[PDB]
Design an enzyme around this catalytic site. Structure first.
Site, PDB file in Angstrom:
ATOM      1  N   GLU B   3     -10.929  -7.419  -0.248  1.00  0.00           N
ATOM      2  CA  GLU B   3      -9.796  -6.539  -0.001  1.00  0.00           C
ATOM      3  C   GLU B   3      -9.499  -6.509   1.492  1.00  0.00           C
ATOM      4  O   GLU B   3      -9.967  -7.374   2.239  1.00  0.00           O
ATOM      5  CB  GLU B   3     -10.069  -5.128  -0.528  1.00  0.00           C
ATOM      6  CG  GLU B   3     -10.620  -5.076  -1.949  1.00  0.00           C
ATOM      7  CD  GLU B   3      -9.591  -5.458  -2.996  1.00  0.00           C
ATOM      8  OE1 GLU B   3      -8.742  -6.329  -2.716  1.00  0.00           O
ATOM      9  OE2 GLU B   3      -9.632  -4.885  -4.105  1.00  0.00           O
ATOM     10  N   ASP B   4      -8.722  -5.522   1.937  1.00  0.00           N
ATOM     11  CA  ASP B   4      -8.307  -5.437   3.333  1.00  0.00           C
ATOM     12  C   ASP B   4      -9.492  -5.439   4.295  1.00  0.00           C
ATOM     13  O   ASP B   4      -9.303  -5.577   5.507  1.00  0.00           O
ATOM     14  CB  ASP B   4      -7.464  -4.180   3.553  1.00  0.00           C
ATOM     15  CG  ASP B   4      -6.233  -4.145   2.673  1.00  0.00           C
ATOM     16  OD1 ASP B   4      -5.916  -5.184   2.055  1.00  0.00           O
ATOM     17  OD2 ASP B   4      -5.579  -3.084   2.599  1.00  0.00           O
ATOM     18  N   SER B   5     -10.709  -5.284   3.778  1.00  0.00           N
ATOM     19  CA  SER B   5     -11.886  -5.411   4.619  1.00  0.00           C
ATOM     20  C   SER B   5     -11.917  -6.792   5.272  1.00  0.00           C
ATOM     21  O   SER B   5     -11.191  -7.712   4.887  1.00  0.00           O
ATOM     22  CB  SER B   5     -13.156  -5.180   3.801  1.00  0.00           C
ATOM     23  OG  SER B   5     -13.366  -6.233   2.879  1.00  0.00           O
ATOM     24  N   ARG B 122       1.907  -8.792   1.249  1.00  0.00           N
ATOM     25  CA  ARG B 122       2.394  -7.937   2.324  1.00  0.00           C
ATOM     26  C   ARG B 122       3.546  -8.551   3.105  1.00  0.00           C
ATOM     27  O   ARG B 122       4.292  -7.812   3.758  1.00  0.00           O
ATOM     28  CB  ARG B 122       1.250  -7.605   3.286  1.00  0.00           C
ATOM     29  CG  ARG B 122       0.084  -6.924   2.600  1.00  0.00           C
ATOM     30  CD  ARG B 122      -1.066  -6.659   3.547  1.00  0.00           C
ATOM     31  NE  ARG B 122      -2.279  -6.319   2.812  1.00  0.00           N
ATOM     32  CZ  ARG B 122      -2.495  -5.151   2.224  1.00  0.00           C
ATOM     33  NH1 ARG B 122      -1.607  -4.171   2.283  1.00  0.00           N
ATOM     34  NH2 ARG B 122      -3.626  -4.962   1.554  1.00  0.00           N
TER      35      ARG B 122
ATOM     36  N   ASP D 462      -9.311  -0.545   2.813  1.00  0.00           N
ATOM     37  CA  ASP D 462      -8.564  -0.317   4.044  1.00  0.00           C
ATOM     38  C   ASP D 462      -8.945   0.990   4.731  1.00  0.00           C
ATOM     39  O   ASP D 462      -8.219   1.440   5.626  1.00  0.00           O
ATOM     40  CB  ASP D 462      -7.060  -0.339   3.756  1.00  0.00           C
ATOM     41  CG  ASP D 462      -6.636   0.715   2.746  1.00  0.00           C
ATOM     42  OD1 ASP D 462      -7.071   1.879   2.870  1.00  0.00           O
ATOM     43  OD2 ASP D 462      -5.865   0.377   1.824  1.00  0.00           O
TER      44      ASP D 462
END
Ligand SMILES: [Mg+2]
Ligand SMILES: [Zn+2]
Ligand SMILES: [Zn+2]
Ligand SMILES: [Zn+2]
Lengths: 81, 131, 171, 539, 112, 142, 262, 97
Positions: B3-5, B122, D462
């Site tokens: 994920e955004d990690s 995105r 996030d």
DNA sequence: CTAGTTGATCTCATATTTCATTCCTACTCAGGAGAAGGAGCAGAGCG
DNA sequence: CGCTCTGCTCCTTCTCCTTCCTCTCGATGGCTATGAGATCAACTAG
RNA sequence: AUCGAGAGGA
């Protein structure tokens, strides 16, 4: 009214969960274990083993909406889960 | 870095990447007015950082003031938020030593790895151009 | 006075006592809080009629812990006082201002305010009995008393005895 | 001690003033809550909930810990209207015969006969009110429907009834021939209402009578309801209710004072209104009219209604949902090498959350080791509880190497691997967003979840946070491991579909792996096969 | 018929979004809204103004007003609801708590 | 009244003498249960023996209770006790009144009425005079 | 708001659905008494296709040449051909299916033949074939009589309600009316012999499995159906919506009233 | 941390009755009070050091029960008490069968 | 056991009376939908 | 056909109304007195 | 500590 009980003969998942929890709780209180010991120190494993061989000495009291109830022995209940 | 990690180079942090200071000044006042009210801080009998400055002064009312500033170093850690200039915010998923990171022919090793899947959903084509 | 009634008791059992012996152990438990008990509704519970044939009616597991609960029913014998009741009892101890007398299982305080005024305390008697009139009341002698209500206490039950009356005198 | 039971039913009703007088343990007379440190026997006296270190609480001992409060008593000089029942009081007087004690209508009218047949009490008088409110006369003789020539001599008064209009905290009766209704007269007529009339009006002869809708004695909430205050350096700063009750006491004292001496009739009239106003707002400081009570500090007074109404009240903010312990919150990160039902928990978090495991022959040896480790090392405990409840603290005692365990004791064991625990992502929109996971202790400061379990949570790395809840009993553990266990919610009843699956790079990775053009050398294959934990060792 | 129309109506809203929800969940909702022989809304003037347990009704949006009505009418609550047992801190009569567990002495004593 | 067996049982105003008989019966019942597991002087000691082995002797009050009841017991022989049961109960007397008459010593109706306020206004003096003499002679037989 | 309205709707051990007051809301949960988690989309073959297409797929005749069962399919060949006793069973079976075909048209006017139903029958059959590698190139050992009676036997064991009374029995038949129609579609004589060349060992195992699979899918009494339904309705709303607010609230003064006249 | 309304709602869907009770009583607010049988009120004088109980206004010394309820619930009743409402609690159901 | 003396504690009038007891509201600014009660009106039955 | 009645519709008033967590700042929390006379109690000893 | 407001994050 043990004659012509209209409830299911199977073992409701909620009944299974609560019976296992109660039996494990009793086992944790140094209750008499009814099955052979295979090193399973944890009470819940002992409870599952007891339920597997129908060695739990408990009977459920299913309550119908009107207020009546039916007593089902844990031994007779069919565990299919 | 699923994920955004993101994955961050541990050895890069050791060399000073994204190191930061942190000051947090405390305060306390002498006492209230003089109608039988008094209190002091002369070591009466019976956060994490060092003391930076202890300032002793008085307000216009003559009450002794003490301001203590303690500073500390906050090193990047797993879970600390980071973000580019395009809304691509994320947290350090894990840190790897330099040897474990992928390396180009020249030996340049990335300071940070981010997931490809963050790009299409995105639509940050501006971010790619900046790189 | 003496009556027979079907009483009920709720008993909580610790899980460790869930052996087969429980069937009789619970019965045993019943005894120590039925035999010679105190209550304001039935007076004093003396003995359990029909000791056998103990009612159990299945145990219910408290959802809190494994402890079980049983609503045991049982026929029991009780003793209950009543206002104006005449009883022939005994005298246990004397007093400056009356007597303490045993009426079966209960205690009755025969106070000086309620014996005939011609009956007066005699400090010189051993025991210190009341002997100024015909109603000679002492520890070793029987007594007949009237119950002018029962002032029951939480721990025990005691009543008030009177001799200032035509009948139910000394012995 | 006393028998233990569980609540089966709740019966609502109104206090009988004699009941209020009987229940109370003290009569409140002085607005003063204090001299230097002693407390006046007329208010907040020891007969109510005593302050800490004072084991009196009207002889209840136990300090503030195990002793609830005991209610006081106030006797109003003049009865006042209960605010919540103003509307119903207006409705009731619109149906009673207005100083005759009977109902305006009677069984002899067919319309209300059907209304009396209505089984629903709440709907019963609502229908009756629609009828009697229009009747402006309670004539003694009413012609009989069966015999028109025959009349029933029912109405004792036989006069007309005024039109009743709500005006602030008082009612005005416009007689059809106009004055303010007197509070006292309402009690008289209500006391004259026959018990039979209660049933038609939906009241209960033993739990709710019309006369009880008028306050003649105020129950005094004990100090715990309005806790003694120490915000500042020995400054009282007491709760609003204490200030408000004192305000009413000041008004009540004045009212009787004016009546007893001098009797300036008009001044008494306004004095009663102030008592009615203060009492009215004390229970509900939010009325339709302008009057708003303002505290001396300048803020509105928070009446009892405010303590219950809306969120942050006793119900939504303190009963339905409440702060809980044995819980943790932190940021989340992904971990491919972590099974679904598993989760990574920081050692620090694991070292503070505890579980009260009971000492038994099966684990007396193991638990002893955890005690020996103490609360410092991870696999240890913080407290040891004896049979009597003596909560031994292992932190402040070297006896960790000396305490001997006995069967039946409880040990506050540290959270260890495989212990069921419950996660939660705010908002907990649906069922899948609250599942029970097994624990693996991770040496860092963030929760570690598998990737495929993020979809049901709607979570993301996030910078999201998840709450952790730890059960404290074996029975609670069983249900989490048997009902809320993650693998049991793979198929969601939401849409008959598996709410989880392979997502993100893993989903993209498989496509490349399983292409017809992809081939794996011998060297690579052996490493891949070993990574399968269920492999049988056959190439 | 209105029950069918209501179902056909709500189904469109959920389906229009592209999400799919089982028949049962939507079927239950419309059924509850039309058990009273009418469209009982879910507002303060709809579901709340029912005959259900008084204590349960207080917590939804109107509390102090509801208590007075229950107090004035001497309403008795049976505590068969979920909120009541939640407020009183008891085991709610749901799921694992919808039944009771008894000790089978006959089987226990038999099993020696 | 109604018991817990679902049976509408009247208030059993047990007589003092028959109360002693039933406590003896229950004591012997308990004695057999453990095995599986008439002048006042004789009865006082025999029952004391029964109580001293069925229990550990801690409940001294009950021994004090039981002993003095034998001392004041008016119908000790159970066989003759049966006579006063049908004699008193068959007359329609209130059970408490029956217990009142079968536990105390009385000879004449006026004494019964004075001692028993309930009978002073509704009892047939003829029945009291006949029975009380009979019970008075019966009492002397013990 | 939605949860509080449905907070106290639970399935009771009588298999009905009630609120706290005991008022009955649904006499059978979802009108079938089946847990949602055990449902999945399945195709109802008997609905779609032309009349002839349905006929040739299901009609079997032991007398005429139009629908002659191939003897090579079964160990018993011509012995079955010409047997009137068996022919009567096929006529009853075919008539039974014919009623289902026209019955389902009324139920699903649009003719959509893919609806959620419990127990994925197709998956079970495929598992049966692969379970012991049924040989699809040799005659089977089954008989027409055994297939017909076996299927009818299965319908008797699909018990959702246990009461022995007429009311319960009448409701019991209604509950599985749609599900059994799916059984008769995919367990037809021709299909179980031509399309699915099962054996005696397979067929007995398949039926015994369906019963076990079906019963396990019954909704468990005590389920908190009320909250479960409200949450399912609410969560998609986080993603038209003002209309939903216009539905829960009666909102008599709607925004865009409309008619659809045919 | 807060166990909000949706937090309990999820458990209700799961059916974990015991856990929900534990989260609301053992985790916090567990409190024991005594109740008069005659009047369902928390107006029992419990001199626990002497095992003495009483309910002034009922003269009841024999019919007392212990109930475990959230401390917040005790307040709610006591604020209703001060509001002239009587939330009488009874441990016996009026209707048996 | 108990009267005595003195520490302690409850209740009140002595001193300060001083210097006027703040203001006047302004300001618009969100708001919408449902329930309640008055008001008018008009045909229907009655005299 | 006028009087009177009553439901019925209509048209205002009149309320009563919306997850979880971490920081910061800031105003305020504030009681009314004097001791002294007179009463009770605490200590003490015969 | 208290309420009160503001900022910000999930
Ligand atoms: Mg996020
Ligand atoms: Zn107390
Ligand atoms: Zn009148
Ligand atoms: Zn009481």
């Amino acid at each position: 009214p043990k004659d012509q009980r209209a409830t299911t003969p199977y073992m409701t998942k909620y009944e299974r969960a609560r019976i296992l929890g109660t039996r494990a709780l009793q086992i944790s209180m140094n209750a008499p274990v009814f099955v052979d010991l295979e090193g399973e120190t944890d009470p819940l494993r002992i409870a599952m083993k007891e339920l597997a061989e129908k060695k739990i000495p408990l009977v459920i009291r299913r309550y119908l909406p009107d207020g009546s109830f039916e007593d089902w022995s844990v031994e007779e209940l069919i565990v299919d889960l | 870095n699923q994920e955004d990690s993101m994955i961050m180079n541990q050895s890069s942090i050791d060399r000073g990447l994204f190191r930061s200071l942190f000051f947090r000044s405390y305060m306390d006042q002498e006492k209230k007015y003089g109608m039988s009210i008094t209190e002091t801080f002369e070591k009466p009998q019976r956060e994490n950082g060092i003391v930076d400055q202890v300032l002793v002064t008085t307000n216009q009312d003559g009450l002794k003031f003490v301001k203590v500033r303690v500073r500390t170093t906050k090193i990047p850690q797993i879970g600390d938020k980071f973000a580019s200039r395009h809304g691509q915010k994320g947290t350090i998923g894990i840190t790897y030593r330099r040897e474990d990171m992928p390396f180009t022919a020249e030996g340049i090793v990335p300071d940070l790895i981010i997931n490809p899947h963050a790009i299409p959903s995105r639509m940050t084509v501006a971010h790619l151009i900046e790189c | 006075m003496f009556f027979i009634k079907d009483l009920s008791l709720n008993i909580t059992l610790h899980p460790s006592f869930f052996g087969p012996r429980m069937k009789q152990y619970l019965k045993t438990k019943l005894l120590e809080e039925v035999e010679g008990s105190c209550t304001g509704k039935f007076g004093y519970i003396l003995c359990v009629l029909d000791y056998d044939n103990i009612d159990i009616q299945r145990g219910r597991i408290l959802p809190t812990d494994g402890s079980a609960e049983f609503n045991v029913k049982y026929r029991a014998v009780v003793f209950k006082p009543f206002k104006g009741e005449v009883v022939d009892g005994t005298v246990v101890s004397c007093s400056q201002h009356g007597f303490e007398v045993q009426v079966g299982p209960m205690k009755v305080f025969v106070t000086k305010h309620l014996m005939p005024q011609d009956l007066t305390f005699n400090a010189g008697s051993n025991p210190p009995s009341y002997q100024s009139s015909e109603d000679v009341i002492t520890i070793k002698s029987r007594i007949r008393v009237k119950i002018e209500g029962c002032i029951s206490q939480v721990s025990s039950i005691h009543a008030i005895g009177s001799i200032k009356e035509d009948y139910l005198g000394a012995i | 001690s006393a028998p233990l039971r569980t609540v089966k039913e709740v019966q609502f009703g109104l206090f009988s003033p004699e009941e209020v007088r009987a229940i109370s343990v003290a009569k409140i007379r002085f607005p003063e809550t204090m001299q230097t440190r002693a407390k006046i026997g007329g208010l907040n006296d020891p007969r109510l909930g005593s302050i800490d270190r004072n084991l009196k609480c009207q002889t209840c001992q136990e300090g503030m810990n195990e002793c609830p409060g005991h209610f006081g008593h106030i006797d109003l000089a003049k009865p006042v209207f209960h605010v919540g029942f103003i509307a119903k009081i207006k409705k009731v007087c619109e149906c009673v015969c207005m100083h005759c004690g009977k109902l305006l209508l009677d069984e002899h009218n067919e319309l209300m006969r059907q209304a009396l047949a209505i089984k629903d009490s709440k709907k019963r008088f609502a229908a009756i009110w629609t009828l009697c409110k229009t009747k402006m006369v309670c004539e003694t003789d009413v012609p009989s429907e069966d015999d028109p020539t025959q009349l029933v001599s029912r109405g004792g008064c036989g006069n007309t009834q005024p039109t009743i209009r709500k005006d602030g905290l008082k009612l005005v009766g416009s007689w059809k021939k106009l004055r303010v209704l007197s509070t006292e007269e309402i009690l008289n007529i209500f006391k004259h209402i026959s018990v039979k009339d209660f049933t038609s009006l939906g009241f209960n002869e033993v739990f709710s009578r019309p006369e009880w809708m008028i306050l003649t004695c105020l129950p005094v909430p004990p100090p715990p309801v309005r806790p003694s205050i120490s915000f500042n350096e020995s400054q009282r700063g007491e709760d609003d209710l204490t200030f408000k009750l004192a305000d009413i006491l000041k008004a009540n004292i004045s009212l009787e004072t004016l009546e007893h001496n001098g009797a300036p009739h008009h001044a008494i009239e306004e004095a009663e209104s102030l008592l009615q106003f203060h009492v009215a707002t004390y229970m509900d400081n939010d009325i339709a009219g302008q009057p708003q009570a303002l505290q001396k500090s300048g803020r509105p007074v928070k009446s009892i209604r405010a303590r219950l109404k809306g969120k942050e009240g006793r119900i939504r903010g303190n009963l339905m949902g409440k702060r809980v312990d044995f819980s943790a919150r932190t940021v989340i990160s992904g971990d491919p090498n972590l099974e679904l039902d598993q989760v990574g928990v920081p050692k620090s978090i694991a070292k503070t959350l505890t579980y009260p495991e009971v000492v038994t022959p099966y684990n007396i040896d193991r638990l002893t080791q955890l005690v020996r480790n103490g609360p410092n090392e991870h696999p240890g405990a913080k407290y040891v509880i004896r049979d009597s409840g003596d909560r031994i603290d292992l932190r402040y005692s070297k006896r960790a190497g000396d305490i001997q365990l006995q069967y039946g004791w409880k040990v506050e064991r540290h959270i260890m691997d495989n212990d069921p625990v419950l996660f939660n992502r705010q908002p907990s929109l649906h069922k899948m967003s609250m599942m029970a996971h097994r624990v693996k202790v991770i040496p860092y400061s963030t929760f570690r979840l598998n990737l495929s379990v993020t979809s049901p949570y709607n979570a993301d790395f996030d910078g999201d946070e998840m709450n952790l809840h730890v059960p404290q009993s074996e029975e609670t553990r069983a249900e989490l491991s048997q009902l809320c266990a993650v693998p049991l919610q793979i198929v969601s009843p939401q849409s008959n579909k598996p709410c989880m699956g392979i997502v993100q790079d893993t989903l993209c990775g498989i496509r490349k792996l399983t292409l017809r053009d992809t081939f794996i050398e011998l060297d690579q294959v052996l490493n891949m096969l070993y990574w399968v934990p269920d492999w049988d060792g056959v190439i | 018929a209105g029950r069918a129309a209501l179902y056909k109506e709500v189904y469109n809203v959920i389906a229009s979004d592209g999400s799919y929800v089982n028949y049962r969940h939507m079927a239950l909702l419309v059924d509850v809204m039309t058990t009273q022989g009418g469209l009982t809304s879910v507002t303060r003037h709809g579901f709340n103004r029912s005959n259900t347990g008084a204590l349960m009704r207080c917590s939804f949006e109107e509390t102090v007003e509801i208590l007075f009505e229950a107090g004035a009418s001497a309403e008795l609550d049976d505590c068969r609801g979920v909120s009541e047992n939640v407020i009183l801190g008891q085991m709610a009569p749901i799921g694992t708590g919808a039944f009771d567990v008894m000790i089978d002495e006959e089987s226990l004593v038999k099993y020696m | 009244q109604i018991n817990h067996q679902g049976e509408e049982e009247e208030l059993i105003a047990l007589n003092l003498s028959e109360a002693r008989l039933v406590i003896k019966e229950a004591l012997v019942e308990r004695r057999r249960a453990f095995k599986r597991s008439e002048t006042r002087e004789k009865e006082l000691e025999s029952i004391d023996v029964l109580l001293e082995q069925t229990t550990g002797g801690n409940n001294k009050d009950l021994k004090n209770t039981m002993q003095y009841l034998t001392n004041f017991s008016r119908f000790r022989d159970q066989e003759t006790v049966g006579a006063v049961i049908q004699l008193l109960k068959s007359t329609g007397l209130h059970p408490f009144e029956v217990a009142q008459l079968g536990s105390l010593a009385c000879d004449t109706a006026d004494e019964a009425k004075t001692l028993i306020p309930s009978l002073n206004n509704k009892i047939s003096d003829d029945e009291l005079e006949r029975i009380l003499k009979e019970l008075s002679n019966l009492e002397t037989l013990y | 708001r939605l949860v509080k309205a449905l907070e106290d709707i639970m399935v009771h051990y009588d298999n009905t659905t009630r609120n706290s007051l005991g008022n009955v809301i649904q006499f059978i949960y979802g009108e079938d008494g089946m847990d949602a988690a055990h449902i999945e989309k399945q195709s109802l073959d008997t609905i779609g296709g032309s009349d002839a297409a349905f006929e040739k797929r299901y009609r079997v005749d032991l007398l005429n040449t139009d629908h002659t069962l191939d003897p090579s399919l079964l160990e018993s060949g011509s012995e079955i051909l010409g047997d009137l006793k068996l022919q009567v069973l096929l006529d009853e079976e075919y008539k039974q299916l014919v009623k289902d075909r026209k019955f389902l048209r009324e139920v699903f006017v649009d003719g959509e033949a893919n609806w959620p139903l419990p127990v994925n029958i197709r998956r079970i059959i495929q598992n049966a074939q692969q379970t012991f590698h049924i040989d699809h190139t040799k005659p089977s050992d089954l008989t027409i009589k055994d297939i017909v009676l076996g299927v009818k036997d299965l319908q008797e064991n699909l018990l959702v309600l246990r009461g022995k009374n007429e009311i319960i029995q009448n409701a019991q038949r209604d509950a599985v009316t749609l599900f059994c129609c799916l059984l008769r579609s995919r367990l037809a004589t021709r299909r179980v012999l031509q399309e699915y060349r099962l054996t005696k060992q397979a067929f007995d195992w398949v039926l015994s499995n369906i019963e076990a699979q079906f019963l396990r899918s019954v909704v468990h009494p005590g389920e908190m159906v009320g909250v479960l339904a409200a949450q399912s309705i609410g969560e998609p709303a986080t993603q038209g919506v003002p209309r939903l607010k216009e539905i829960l609230n009666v909102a008599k003064n709607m925004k865009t009233p409309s008619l659809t006249v045919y | 941390l807060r166990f909000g309304e949706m937090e309990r709602d999820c458990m209700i869907a799961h059916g974990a009755a015991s856990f929900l009770k534990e989260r609301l009583m053992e985790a916090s607010d567990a409190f024991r009070v005594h109740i008069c049988g005659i009047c369902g009120l928390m107006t029992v004088i419990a001199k626990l050091n002497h095992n003495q109980f009483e309910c002034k206004g009922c003269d009841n010394k024999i019919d007392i029960y212990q109930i475990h309820i959230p401390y917040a619930a005790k307040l709610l009743f006591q604020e209703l008490m001060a509001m002239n409402i009587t939330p009488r609690l009874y441990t016996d159901r009026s209707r048996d069968f």
